[PDB]
Write an enzyme that holds these catalytic residues in place. Structure first.
Site, short mmCIF file in Angstrom:
data_model
loop_
_atom_site.label_atom_id
_atom_site.label_comp_id
_atom_site.label_asym_id
_atom_site.label_seq_id
_atom_site.Cartn_x
_atom_site.Cartn_y
_atom_site.Cartn_z
N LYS A 14 0.81 -1.23 0.00
CA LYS A 14 0.00 0.00 0.00
C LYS A 14 0.84 1.27 0.00
O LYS A 14 0.31 2.37 0.10
CB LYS A 14 -0.97 0.00 1.17
CG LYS A 14 -1.95 -1.15 1.07
CD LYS A 14 -3.12 -1.03 2.05
CE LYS A 14 -4.11 -2.16 1.81
NZ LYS A 14 -5.35 -1.96 2.61
N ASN A 15 2.15 1.13 -0.12
CA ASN A 15 3.03 2.28 -0.19
C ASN A 15 3.10 2.75 -1.64
O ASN A 15 3.38 1.97 -2.55
CB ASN A 15 4.42 1.91 0.38
CG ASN A 15 5.48 2.96 0.11
OD1 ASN A 15 5.88 3.16 -1.03
ND2 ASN A 15 5.98 3.61 1.17
#
Ligand code: 7TO
Ligand code: FPP
Ligand code: ZN
EC number: 2.5.1.58
Lengths: 406, 317
Positions: free
Chosen positions: B111-112
């Protein structure tokens, strides 16, 4: 005498539980999980045999915030490139709770953001870090919240405009930072800082409204770039940028209204960020903040059917969700129960709560304040998510100077 | 990446002899800091030395290995990613081992944002998408709704024109979870960029598919939103059988979505000067009322307003 004031606690509310049609998927399994957990929060009062009342734990929140404004544990290492964000989230949460900023803290924030400011324009996530539109937005907003001459003068407007031109793309869009990519959030970041500090040239946002318009999809909401799923964070940023640009009309507002209103969860009362995903406190702002924006837009078109007392969402249920489900007993606010607190969720839960409390359209003012009357927050401007006073004051002060190139 | 950050034998850079020539650069936060993070010894040590190499613009193998540690400690630090990319190019590092590297970090921190951007730069540099659809599919196998994964997939498909097998993929995933809104959006993304929705054999296949899904799972809002999405540009009242066929579902499938779709048809009917104006508007008001009052009260202010809108423009008036 048998009348429940809290919408979430009424017997007919149990009908709003998920109907899974006996077809189980990850999505329905996960939604059911949250709902079981939330129901148990709603039911707590009856089960312990006590009368409910909703109190915003202002003192706990205040101490969490006043401490974090100075010092953070190694748990915020993951935000070492987002320090102006922390200033903005914390100072905005304090302004919503009506806590003044010691003039000296004001000046310490000022000096710090000065260290974050790049010589070529904009702000980075920390001293000596390269600039980026997100921390530039946060720095500007924080400085406007402080709102002193000192704060206003930290911002180098000439360089800011250069920086913005350096990110501007052929197709309307802006890079989030040099060597980076584009999304709707960067256009919003650019529009916010540009409009507040009065540096909008005639060509700066050429193509930007149309680029944003391409991001609206089959759902009615806006995705991060054209072709992507509709999402509340991007939708907020898309519409608010267009409000600043006075091109609200570039979008299909009817599909947009229908999409966002659908994002309020019938059981939980809060908002989800996308269709078929879970409720989350921060969308209390991103999603619910779209309603004041659509109101001003539709009203400016002469929509005779608009309410003069209420936003087009269940203001009451959103307040019940935040107050009952999103407060950390130690101070701070949350995505949902069982999540851990942070300053982002603290900022946007409070921001959303304020929007749920205060309706305003022309001379028509109307508050709705669930729980005790001290729960009432200071209002927030739906475009900038700083105080309406800070906004008016900043725009007025920067209109004193010419758009660089004049 | 020779000595791992979680190695029992990890040693601070300040205790490494191969770094003895360079003086670390402490972060300057000013005389009285705000939002001051009290970093671990490990974190501060890495970043003091990162500040030193960045400051001097030292384009060396030791610097490159250091960016790895700085990224691992804060993968959101876009300054470090930028410098790592300067180094990849100056040192003429093999971009395929760097792809192996980004693959591992994305698996760990899916999710980065910065990690996905870095991967796209490498794909661009290599001009090679051959591993992408399979990699993305592994990420999506762990989280089928990962926004960055869907975006990268869209980007890859678009940029290298790799549309041919995507609809099969969508159908696999729709079968796994027919409530996955990301997949309904992907379905739409593929069709609108290939056949399109005007080919009448396609529009009918799609509408029949959706209705078939709506029948198996009547409270799945994504299918309703798709159906509505693929018919509404042209106008719902252009399809006169649609009203009838939904009214027929009502008996044994009446979600508030069916009712709300019924209201959308009536509004288009009324807008295109249909038969029986005084009437159709009433049937819809009955429906709005049922929604604001009984079936969908969370949206009471919305449905009220639709009522008031429909009244103000379609009564005897
Ligand atoms: C600790 O895990 C994190 C995950 C993502 C992030 S994020 O930097 O990419 N960012 C902000 C964010 C900050 C915190 C804190 N503290 C927590 C979460 C968070 N997220 C993730 C999230 C929040 N709620 C659910 N989730 C999964 C959001 C994320 C993206 C973001 C960045 C800037 C934003 O501001 S903005 O729209 O006004 C902009 F236009 F300026 F960008 C808004 C959202 C940070 C931490
Ligand atoms: C920006 C971005 C990736 C939003 C979705 O995050 P997310 O999927 O973690 O948040 P959400 O599921 O609430 O949309
Ligand atoms: Zn959140």
């Amino acid at each position: 005498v048998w009348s429940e004031p809290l919408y979430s606690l009424r017997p007919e509310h149990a009908r709003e539980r998920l109907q899974d049609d006996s077809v189980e998927t990850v999505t329905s399994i996960e939604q059911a999980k949250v709902e079981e957990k939330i129901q148990e929060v709603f039911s707590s009062y009856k089960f312990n045999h006590l009368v409910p009342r909703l109190v915003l734990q202002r003192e706990k929140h205040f101490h969490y915030l006043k401490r974090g404004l100075r010092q953070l544990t190694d748990a915020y290492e993951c935000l070492d490139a987002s320090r102006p964000w922390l200033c903005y989230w914390i100072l905005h949460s304090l302004e919503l709770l009506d806590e003044p900023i010691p003039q000296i803290v004001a000046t310490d924030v000022c000096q710090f953001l000065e260290l974050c400011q790049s010589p070529d324009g904009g702000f980075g996530g920390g001293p000596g870090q390269y600039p980026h539109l997100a921390p530039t937005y946060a720095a500007v907003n924080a400085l406007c919240i402080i709102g002193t001459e000192e704060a206003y003068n930290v911002i180098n407007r000439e360089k800011l405009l250069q920086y913005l031109y350096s990110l501007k793309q052929p197709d309307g869009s802006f890079l989030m930072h040099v060597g980076g990519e584009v999304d709707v959030r960067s256009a919003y970041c650019a529009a916010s800082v540009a409009s507040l500090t009065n540096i909008i040239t005639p060509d700066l946002f050429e193509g930007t409204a149309e680029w944003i318009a391409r991001c609206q999809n089959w759902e009615g909401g806006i995705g991060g770039v054209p072709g992507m799923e509709a999402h509340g964070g991007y939708t907020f940023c898309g519409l608010a940028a267009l409000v600043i640009l006075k091109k609200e009309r570039s979008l299909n507002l009817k599909s947009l209204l229908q999409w966002v209103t659908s994002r309020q969860m019938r059981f939980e009362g809060g908002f989800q960020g996308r269709c078929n995903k879970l409720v989350d406190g921060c969308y209390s702002f991103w999603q619910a903040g779209l309603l004041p924006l659509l109101h001003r837009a539709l009203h400016a078109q002469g929509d005779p059917a608009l309410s003069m007392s209420h936003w087009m969402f269940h203001q009451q249920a959103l307040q019940e969700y935040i107050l009952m489900c999103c407060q950390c007993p130690a101070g701070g606010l949350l995505d949902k129960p069982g999540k851990s607190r942070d300053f982002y969720h603290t900022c946007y839960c409070l921001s959303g709560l304020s929007i749920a409390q205060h309706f305003g359209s022309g001379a028509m003012l109307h508050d709705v304040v669930m729980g005790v009357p001290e729960n009432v927050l200071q209002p927030t401007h739906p475009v900038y998510n700083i105080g309406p006073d800070k906004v008016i004051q900043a725009t007025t002060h920067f209109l004193q100077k010419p758009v660089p190139g004049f | 990446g020779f000595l791992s950050l979680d190695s029992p034998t990890y040693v601070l850079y300040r205790d490494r002899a191969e770094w003895a020539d360079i003086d670390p650069v402490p972060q300057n936060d000013g005389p009285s800091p705000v939002v001051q993070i009290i970093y671990s010894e490990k974190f501060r040590d890495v970043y003091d030395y990162f500040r030193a190499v960045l400051q001097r613009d030292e384009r060396s193998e030791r610097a490159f290995k250091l960016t790895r540690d700085a990224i691992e400690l804060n993968a959101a630090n876009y300054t470090v990613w930028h410098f790592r990319r300067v180094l990849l190019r100056s040192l003429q590092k093999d971009l395929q081992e760097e792809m192996n590297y980004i693959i591992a970090i994305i698996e760990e921190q899916p999710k980065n944002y910065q990690v996905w951007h870095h991967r796209r730069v490498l794909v661009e540099w290599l001009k090679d998408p051959s591993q992408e659809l399979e990699f993305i599919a592994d990420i999506l196998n762990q989280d089928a709704k990962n926004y960055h994964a869907w975006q990268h997939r869209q980007w890859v498909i678009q940029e290298f024109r790799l549309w041919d097998n995507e609809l099969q993929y969508v159908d696999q995933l729709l079968k796994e979870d027919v409530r996955n809104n990301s997949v309904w959006n992907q379905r739409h993304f593929v069709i609108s960029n290939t056949t399109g929705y005007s080919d009448r054999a396609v529009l009918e296949r799609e509408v029949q598919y959706t209705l078939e899904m709506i029948k198996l799972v009547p409270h799945n809002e994504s299918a309703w939103n798709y159906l509505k999405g693929i018919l509404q540009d042209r106008g719902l009242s252009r399809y006169p059988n649609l009203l009838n066929q939904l009214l027929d579902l009502q008996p044994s499938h009446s979600s508030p979505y069916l009712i709300a779709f019924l209201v959308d048809i009536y509004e288009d009917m009324l807008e295109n000067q249909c038969d029986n104006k005084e009437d159709i508007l009433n049937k819809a008001l009955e429906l709005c009322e049922i929604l604001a009052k009984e079936k969908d009260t969370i949206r009471k202010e919305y449905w009220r307003y639709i009522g008031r809108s429909l009244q103000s423009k379609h009564s005897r008036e």
